[PDB]
Ligand SMILES: *[C@@H]1O[C@H](CO)[C@@H](O[C@@H]2O[C@H](CO)[C@@H](O[C@@H]3O[C@H](CO)[C@@H](O)[C@H](O)[C@@H]3O)[C@H](O)[C@H]2NC(C)=O)[C@H](O)[C@H]1NC(C)=O
Ligand SMILES: *[C@@H]1O[C@H](CO)[C@@H](O[C@@H]2O[C@H](CO)[C@@H](O)[C@H](O)[C@H]2NC(C)=O)[C@H](O)[C@H]1NC(C)=O
Ligand SMILES: *[C@@H]1O[C@H](CO)[C@@H](O)[C@H](O)[C@H]1NC(C)=O
C-alpha cells in the first residue's frame with residue numbers, strides 16, 4: 001500500500017540540535033555566507049570527489065569566478081558524522097532511541113586542490129552566469145531549511161537493472177545532484193564527462209511500515225517489537241560479539257530495521273544484502 005519509492009519528507013524549519021548531540025570535529029568550521037555575484041559574471045562549476053567497499057567517496061561542488069578571482073567549495077554532510085546519522089543512541093531515560101542525524105549545507109572560500117586531486121577527482125563540468133549562481137544560492141537556502149536530516153541507506157529490491165527501489169538516500173551526492181538539476185532548470189549546460197557516485201545499497205523485499213516513534217515506544221505501543229529494535233541497534237555502538245549479533249540479524253535471519261522519515265520500517269534482507277557501488281549518474285540534460 002504505497003508508491004514505488006517512499007518520498008523524502010521535508011520540514012517547514014530546521015530545529016536547533018539537541019544539546020545531547022555534540023561533535024568531536026566541528027561542522028563547517030570555515031563556513032562563510034554565500035556572496036551575491038554580478039549578473040554577467042562567468043562562474044566555472046567544478047566536480048569535487050575524494051575518499052571518505054574500496055570506493056566510498058565524498059562529493060562536493062566547486063565554484064570559481066572570473067570577476068571575484070576567488071573560488072569556493074560547497075558540500076552537504078552530517079553535523080555529527082556518519083555513524084550518528086546511521087544508528088541511534090540508546091538513553092535509559094527514554095523509551096525511544098535518540099538520533100543525531102541532521103545534515104546540512106556548507107559553503108566556504110577556497111578550493112583545496114590537493115585534497116581532491118590526490119586520490120579523487122577535480123574536473124570542471126560547467127560555466128554559469130552570476131545570475132544563475134545567485135538564483136541557485138537562494139534555492140540552496142530553502143533546501144538547507146527544509147531537508148534537515150541525513151540518510152545513509154539506498155534500499156533496492158535487487159542489483160538488477162529495472163529492479164524496484166524502496167528508498168533513496170539523502171546524503172552529499174544527492175545534494176550535488178539536486179544542485180546540478182536546479183542549474184539545469186536555469187538552462188545551464190554541462191560537459192559530457194563520466195560522473196560516478198558512491199551508493200551504499202541494502203537489498204530486501206518490500207518493506208513493511210512499523211510506525212512512528214510514539215507508535216512503537218512508550219505506553220501506546222508494542223513492547224516486544226520495541227525491545228526487538230533496541231536489540232537490533234545495540235551492537236552497532238559501544239566488538240566480536242557485536243559483529244556476530246549483526247551478522248545473525250542481517251545475514252542469518254535476514255532482518256533490518258530502517259529509520260526513514262522519522263518512522264520505523266522492516267527490511268527483509270536478500271541477495272548480496274549490503275553492496276557498495278560506484279556507478280554512473282549522468283549530468284542532467
Ligand atoms: C545550512 O544550515 C546549517 C545548519 O543550520 C548551517 O550551519 C552553520 O553554519 C555556520 C557557518 O556556515 C556555522 O558557524 C561557524 O562556526 C564556526 C565555529 O563553530 C566558526 O569558525 C565560523 O566562522 C562560523 O561562525 C555554524 O556552526 C553551523 N551550524 C549551526 C548549527 O548553526 C549552514 O551555515 C547553512 N548553510 C547554508 C549555505 O545556508
Ligand atoms: C555522535 O554523537 C555522540 C552523542 O552526542 C557524540 O558523543 C559525545 O561527544 C562529546 C564530545 O566529544 C562527549 O563529551 C560526550 O560524552 C559524548 N557522548 C556520548 C554518549 O558518546 C559523538 O561525538 C558523535 N560522533 C562524532 C563523530 O562526532
Ligand atoms: C582556487 O584558488 C586557489 C588560490 O586562491 C588556487 O590555489 C586553486 O588552484 C584554485 N582552485 C581551482 C579549482 O580553481
Ligand SMILES: *[C@@H]1O[C@H](CO)[C@@H](O)[C@H](O)[C@H]1NC(C)=O
Pocket residue numbers: 196278279280
Ligand atoms: C562508472 O559506473 C559505470 C556503471 O554505470 C561503470 O561501468 C564504470 O566502470 C564506472 N567507472 C569507474 C571509473 O568506476
